[PDB]
Design a binder for this molecule. Structure first.
Ligand SMILES: Cc1cccc(Cc2nn(C(C)(C)C)c3ncnc(N)c23)c1
Length: 278
């Protein structure tokens, strides 16, 4: 506050009013804001500039400008990236349905029909972004948002492409929770687009069984399992799950990424086709 500081807060404070805090997201705090002129509401992520991975701010702006030009119904739309001396402000579509993990906590397990509806949308988004050589790396249920509270609303993947630009919060809200979804080759420091197929496979495993494939009491124990890549469908929870579902998951959780299916192949898989409309 104060005239000088408000002036130096730059174009974001001029253009937008903060209505309320919405919660801590990866990389930064998310707030609901309003465009002062139009009164339309948006979500804004406020990211400390100390959290930039790239020391050249112009590269961050370029990256985000490329992401603004993209358009797919299962990818969050971005409208603006603004700055002041301390922070980046990324403004985009506001959602009100909460995240996919909230929905996992609520429902516990999803029928094959319901899981296929959700995961097909994830696959569609991933396929689209991969066609533009964008990798998520951090795909997890917390980065899959429900557009609204309406029944069967569209899901929206958030933060897709921002991991090249920003490092995680110093204080993260659920660090152990991130280990479940990370691809083994990402842990090794050598990733390409296939890591998003792995993460989506972990999500699908959880939707169907209610349990993670790589588990443990702490981050270390979970990551030790991920690193070996060994998992099973031995739980009674898998007893009556279709062979087709298990086949898709096996292909997605293939250890070597060169041998792992593509996102496009996931969409074509018989299990997804069984539940698609026409
Ligand atoms: C890059 C960016 C900017 C603003 C918001 C997000 C994701 C997001 N995150 N969150 C949380 C759920 C508050 C973390 C949102 N709530 C409502 N609408 C949203 N779009 C979000 C991502």
């Amino acid at each position: 506050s104060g005239r000088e500081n408000l002036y130096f807060q730059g174009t974001f404070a001029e253009r937008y009013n903060i209505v309320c805090m919405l919660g801590k997201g990866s990389f930064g705090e998310v707030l609901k804001c309003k465009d002062r002129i139009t009164q339309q509401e948006y979500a804004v992520k406020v990211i400390n500039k100390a959290s930039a991975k790239n020391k050249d701010t112009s590269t961050i702006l370029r990256e985000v400008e490329l992401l603004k030009k993209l358009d797919h119904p299962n990818i969050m739309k971005l409208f603006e990236i603004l700055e002041d001396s301390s922070s980046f402000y990324i403004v985009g579509e506001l959602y009100t349905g909460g995240e996919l993990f909230d929905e996992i906590i609520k429902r516990k397990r999803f029928s094959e029909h319901d899981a296929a509806r959700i995961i097909k949308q994830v696959f569609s988004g991933i396929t689209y972004m991969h066609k533009h050589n964008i990798v998520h790396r951090d795909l997890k249920p917390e980065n899959i948002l429900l557009e609204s509270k309406e029944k069967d609303c569209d899901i929206k993947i958030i933060d897709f492409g921002l991991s090249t630009c920003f490092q995680q919060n110093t204080k993260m809200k659920d660090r152990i929770g991130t280990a479940y979804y990370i691809a083994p080759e990402v842990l090794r420091g050598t990733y390409d687009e296939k890591c998003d197929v792995w993460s989506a496979g972990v999500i699908l495993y959880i939707l169907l069984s209610g349990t993670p494939p790589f588990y443990g009491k702490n981050e270390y124990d979970i990551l030790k399992r991920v690193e070996t890549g060994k998992y099973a469908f031995d739980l009674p929870q898998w007893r009556t799950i279709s062979d087709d579902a298990k086949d898709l998951i096996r292909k997605m959780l293939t250890f070597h990424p060169s041998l792992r299916i593509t996102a496009t192949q996931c969409l074509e898989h018989p299990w997804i086709q069984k539940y698609s409309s026409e």
